[PDB]
Design an enzyme around this catalytic site. Sequence first.
Site, PDB file in Angstrom:
ATOM      1  N   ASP A  35     -11.950  -7.266  10.422  1.00 50.23           N
ATOM      2  CA  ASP A  35     -13.258  -7.403   9.783  1.00 50.23           C
ATOM      3  C   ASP A  35     -13.658  -8.874   9.744  1.00 50.23           C
ATOM      4  O   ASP A  35     -13.203  -9.616   8.869  1.00 50.23           O
ATOM      5  CB  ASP A  35     -13.203  -6.823   8.379  1.00 50.23           C
ATOM      6  CG  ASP A  35     -14.522  -6.931   7.663  1.00 50.23           C
ATOM      7  OD1 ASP A  35     -15.528  -7.240   8.335  1.00 50.23           O
ATOM      8  OD2 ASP A  35     -14.551  -6.700   6.438  1.00 50.23           O
ATOM      9  N   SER A 199     -30.005 -15.897  15.421  1.00 52.52           N
ATOM     10  CA  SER A 199     -30.521 -15.379  16.674  1.00 52.52           C
ATOM     11  C   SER A 199     -31.925 -15.922  16.909  1.00 52.52           C
ATOM     12  O   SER A 199     -32.687 -16.169  15.969  1.00 52.52           O
ATOM     13  CB  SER A 199     -30.537 -13.845  16.646  1.00 52.52           C
ATOM     14  OG  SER A 199     -31.251 -13.312  17.747  1.00 52.52           O
TER      15      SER A 199
END
Length: 330
Positions: A35, A199
């Site tokens: 994770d 992004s």
Amino acid sequence: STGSATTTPIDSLDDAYITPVQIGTPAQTLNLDFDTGSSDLWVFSSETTASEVDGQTIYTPSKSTTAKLLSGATWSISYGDGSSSSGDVYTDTVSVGGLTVTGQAVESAKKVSSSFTEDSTIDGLLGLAFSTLNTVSPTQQKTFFDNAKASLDSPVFTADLGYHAPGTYNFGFIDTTAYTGSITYTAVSTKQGFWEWTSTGYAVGSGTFKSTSIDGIADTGTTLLYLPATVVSAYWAQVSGAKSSSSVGGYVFPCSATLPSFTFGVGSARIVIPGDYIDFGPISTGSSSCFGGIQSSAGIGINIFGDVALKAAFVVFNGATTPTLGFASK
């Protein structure tokens, strides 16, 4: 040193991925959910409340000659999906795909929430976010990656998640045969303890690219892709019959639909998620309503590039002094 281990979807939907991890001496192999969005290595154990264990493999520290109680240390974690767990802490030898860390904090669960009990295939979590998020008290502990970092050939790990298929986690090296083209690296902020990056925008299907900054985290422990409501609405608007259902808890779409791809920007580069990766199948068995793999982050407070996004890429988690993230098509 290096390590390399295969990671395998737990089910036909890629809800999560499990990777075998050797703990203790002799080795006890548990299948952990790696994770990158959390920083605790915790396991189902001989100390877990029996009623909360349903088929998981347990770590029994009393059977490990290298286990040592980390005296006074406890841990307690809550995750985004209301799931929680807590317990005490041992140090033990932990190996992943040939890479060994001695003295790794192994957090033994005394309690787990029902979400974990119901997940008979997940024996625990291996956190790979920054150690500042580790919950061990009163002495915070380092992740497996943080402990291994100085010994690795390069202070990196890579996630190459498969679509309905196994993939690979590598530590210490970049497999240059595992991706196409070049890896585009992008800056990481550690201020929240995550692999947090921005992004450069998105496109839906064959549409043009929308330049827009989307701050989010690379999280192998989250199934889906969570993006701002504006972006998610623009995606699902292209799918006839798709709508957000409060009763279901997100966007659903007719199972008869073919979904458009979703592109996200990494600097000037582009990662294209095929439409099929966004189909999470019937909301319940036999239903003709299917659950979408792109969902709104509006109620979360952060955008999450979960497995839906990451499995479309070869992803480098560069833990150099200034961390960066790398993405390549594959």
